[PDB]
């Protein structure tokens, strides 16, 4: 078995390949993915695994330079805004319209699908360098 | 989206296409999957989800007619033998040695991996029919 | 056997990977599907299925934000132009030129085809969201 | 479009490429679908469509020669059994063990899924000969 | 075996499938084929078969709204030229120039490759309705 | 275009890979084509190609050193047989039960269906050397 | 084995589906393959084999009805480019910048690769008719 | 980027799958790969990397619970068989026969290739359960 | 084995299909990779393989005509900036700035990453001839 | 471009990945082809290129460790026989009938063609090593 690193195969191989600037995305259950763009699916029911607890293991695993989320989360999710804040401190936190969040997807390596069943409740995290 | 049925969309595909004695596997973080069987990974770290979580949200979902184990789980892991009796009761449970019950993982559809990290949590789902 | 959601396999996995907005196409026997959609052909002679008995399915099976269907099939096809209007009475239901109809399809994740052999006999389903 | 012949797509595709001999197979929505062949689904709901439209569509577009069912049939069955002896009445119809039945199924070009829900409503259909 | 439609595997394929205004092209043996475009050739050896054989199998399983040929297929190819007109005498047909002719090819469905070696000898079939 | 060889691009493609030994069968309409083996449909209706115009492009344009048929052939249809005989005067023609013919089949590098609509119309090629 | 045509099989696949104004590349050793332009190496070592030897031997397998070089072929490698004007005596030779030349080689069929280690060395068949 | 586990993209792939008793071959420059095993080539020249170098890598990101050599390693190589030893105290060393040893690569998950130069310089590597 | 040329059998496929002009990557382990771009890994651990390690076995196997690289590379790195400068001091090198260097890897035929933990360790060789 | 190694591209991809008794074929232009062996044609036309240029050209760029020829060599075609013979003086030399030859290409990387015209001018280079 892995020692170290993501315990997740399909999140492995992805975290593998991610040079400096690459995007993935982490999603509530109703974000469509764009075609062309891997989908990996984490949900078992509602709430489980929750948006939170995603981006927490995401964030220890790799290296982020930057948070990009729609601005319509600090309204319609206020609570799992501020977890992104507190969470991604010295990191640049960056908020667009929900529609244009939806199109930056598109060059996203992939969506990792989570169960989360509340609003807005989206981040891109833009990999930053180890060295 | 979707209105019924299992939240995962990898796992939906998978449950649409059972037929009466076709096979999945439930299976801890440890069981090496056969080549030519499809993986489907919801791990997110050790112990999410567990095994427990994840049989009940299957055992919801599908109609089992049989369930198979390793009589190894009984003696070293008896928190999870007990929930499969319970969870189970109105099935077939039928225990064979685990070196006998990888062997017949390779003709499951495929193997579902959670985050267990205890000893012989594996067990195989035999759809029963609807009618 | 799978216990819930549409039975057929073949669309179970399409509503599976459905995210809000994504669209679906019901279509008569003649409509033609665009080059890269996928096409789940459920006829099986003239008039079944019919369109309006796939449409019912589909509406039990999957929350929808909108209809959109072309004009035309208020002046020659009266009978089920009026059973959408009923069957979507909240959704909201736009109509558009057929030519316009059918440029929208080449966004859509799939093109179900009924054995339906009454003219504009189509519609456009976008999916809504569960919270 | 196309003016004569069986209706679904999918289904012409497997009847054009049929020889002397070649099987298909008619399910119920239990029967399991043997690993490398090719499964069409016709199923809306339970019982659309049933075991006998969809036999009786592909008796008038496939010149059949032998049809074979499994003995259980006509214990658990017997109304799609007399509708199979009556439809096929010119043809070899042969009973075996469902457990046999399903071996052969092995051999078969394709399986088309019904949406009846009735037990052993299965039969091969084996290609006859035009000349 | 399949007892209606038309004889040819490949072509029963292409057929199925159309839906309106779909396009398909019959082609004398020295046409180009776009790539991207599925090619079908049924020749022989020279003049086997012949542009008028494979355009009258066509007409009798086809439902044709419109026919398209190059205007040079007039003056330098008459026999041929009379023959499409007397064949589709109730279909409208179109000339464009042997150039515009090419171009229109790359939207068609499939183009099928006869053994005429006389000039010009090509045509598209747009697919009308059946209801 | 191609100055030499058999006018037909499927079959120009099999013949140069042709090796000594390599087999290729040519079929009437009812033949079945064993699963794995390339299968270059060129009928058109009921009699177009003839299985003799067929074989008899195919005998000058490929180095036969061998030719087997059904022994079937010699009753059920001995204009067919005779043509054989003749074309193949200088080759050794071997027969064998139409069962073991079909066995053989499996074996070839394609099976080149013809529109014979006679019984046992059927035949293996065996490639000869140029030197 | 095939009688008549070229004796190379690669070739022969790529002469058999040549319509009207296709083009084929014929290369010397260092001349770039666009990327998605099928690529058929012929070199064995420097020299061998040579580009004329490559030409003349296309020049008898196939239809050319125009030839394209590139001007600096005049400059540089004036033997060759002799060769290439009395092979094609009666065939319309047009000679364009070496930078031009190599973006019309992105249409074409394929690039032939010889072991040509003369600068240059690079022509442009474009297939004519036969009829 | 990837912050913990193994550098090397390809080979983080390979450890997300490992199951337990799973294989990967450490392999010197002269190891044949068995049809079907994926290999990885690291060997950038005669000595880079050393078999040392990448053996010592793997056991640091990889739970080895046994390490399998060659005979013949502790006659031609003592010193690589020696570092073996060493780096492998806990786990269990099996010596086969070279012939023997080859005929068990063909069960692994892949063949990492080495820059390493000297005589049966390669080992399997069976996977262990972190629980 | 091969006797001549580089040692990695990844790396030879790609030198082997270089034509003049075509480029190649050698990367730090921080550049991200085109999306359609061949990425060949040969890392370890950081600093193994080194990037001047990597540049020299490239530039001693393949013929440059030209070297490019990132501006940055001067100031931040310069240890490497001056290796690269006495290693192609024949060649012409040209520097841009670093996302204008990144935009052209969308035309490399591959991306070798190596160890090398230093910022803007990075540059693209441009294929030359060997005539 | 490559500075050292085989020329040809296809080939020097196939001598990248052999390893110790890996095999190749060089064949005259009448030896059959396995099903699922790669097969690389050099012919251009009968006796061009010749079996001696081929195999002089991989014994060059191949470390052989045997030879492997049919015994009707010897008789049916002397010349290249002695040619095998001197070429290869130093590796071990063996003879097996044609018929068992050609059974043993069933394991083999590759298959040259050449445009060799003469009988049982065929051999297989089993690969050895450089260390
Ligand atoms: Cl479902
Ligand atoms: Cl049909
Ligand atoms: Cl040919
Ligand atoms: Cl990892």
Known sequence: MKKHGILNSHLAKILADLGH?????????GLPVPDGVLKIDLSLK???????????????????????????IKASNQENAKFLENLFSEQEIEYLSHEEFKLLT??????????????????????????
Request: aromatic share 6%.
């Open 21 to 29: 600037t690459d995007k993935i995305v982490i999603a509530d259950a």
């Open 46 to 72: 509602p709430g489980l695994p929750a948006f939170q607890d995603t981006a927490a293991v995401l964030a220890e695993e790799m290296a982020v330079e930057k948070v990009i989320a729609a601005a319509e």
């Open 106 to 131: 598109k060059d996203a390596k992939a969506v990792i699908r989570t169960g989360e069943f509340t609003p807005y409740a989206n981040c891109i995290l833009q990999a930053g360098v180890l060295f």
